[PDB]
Amino acid sequence: NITGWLEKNKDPVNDTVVDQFKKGSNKLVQEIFEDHPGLGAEEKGGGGK
Amino acid sequence: KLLQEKNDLFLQLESERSGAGDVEERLTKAISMKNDLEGQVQELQERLS
């Protein structure tokens, strides 16, 4: 059952309720929800070193 | 007391082996840091070509 396979390769939290915890006030909340995703740039390529 | 002059002349020397000893990690780290930076350069130039 293919439905949400792409949702699941991204693992669903009803696709909402993560963002606000990532940087909250509470310590125990913020260490669990520290591990940052690929937020800067996703590498394209081109020509250089 | 003659042996104390020997204690210090040897304790100095051994500490100059730990002088060169920390400088063992220091020296060869620079030799490695050359070799990678060489492959950073020669290629970046090659990529202009």
Side-chain angles (χ1 to χ4, degrees), chain A residues 4 6-22 32-33:
Chain A
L6 299 175
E7 195 195 31
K8 282 190 176 177
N9 203 41
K10 184 184 182 186
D11 194 60
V13 64
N14 81 244
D15 285 64
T16 318
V17 292
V18 174
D19 204 11
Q20 197 167 346
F21 301 96
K22 177 190 72 188
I32 285 176
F33 291 107

Side-chain angles (χ1 to χ4, degrees), chain A residues 18-26 29-30 33-34 36:
Chain A
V18 174
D19 204 11
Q20 197 167 346
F21 301 96
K22 177 190 72 188
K23 270 297 182 183
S25 59
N26 188 306
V29 175
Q30 204 249 246
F33 291 107
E34 184 173 52
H36 284 41

Side-chain angles (χ1 to χ4, degrees), chain B residues 2 14 39:
Chain B
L2 294 171
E14 273 283 329

Side-chain angles (χ1 to χ4, degrees), chain B residues 11-37:
Chain B
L11 187 63
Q12 186 58 59
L13 187 59
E14 273 283 329
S15 304
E16 288 167 3
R17 180 248 287 227
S18 41
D22 199 70
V23 175
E24 299 294 358
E25 192 188 88
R26 284 278 289 153
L27 180 70
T28 52
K29 220 162 181 173
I31 301 172
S32 32
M33 283 306 287
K34 171 199 147 59
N35 282 262
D36 167 71
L37 284 164

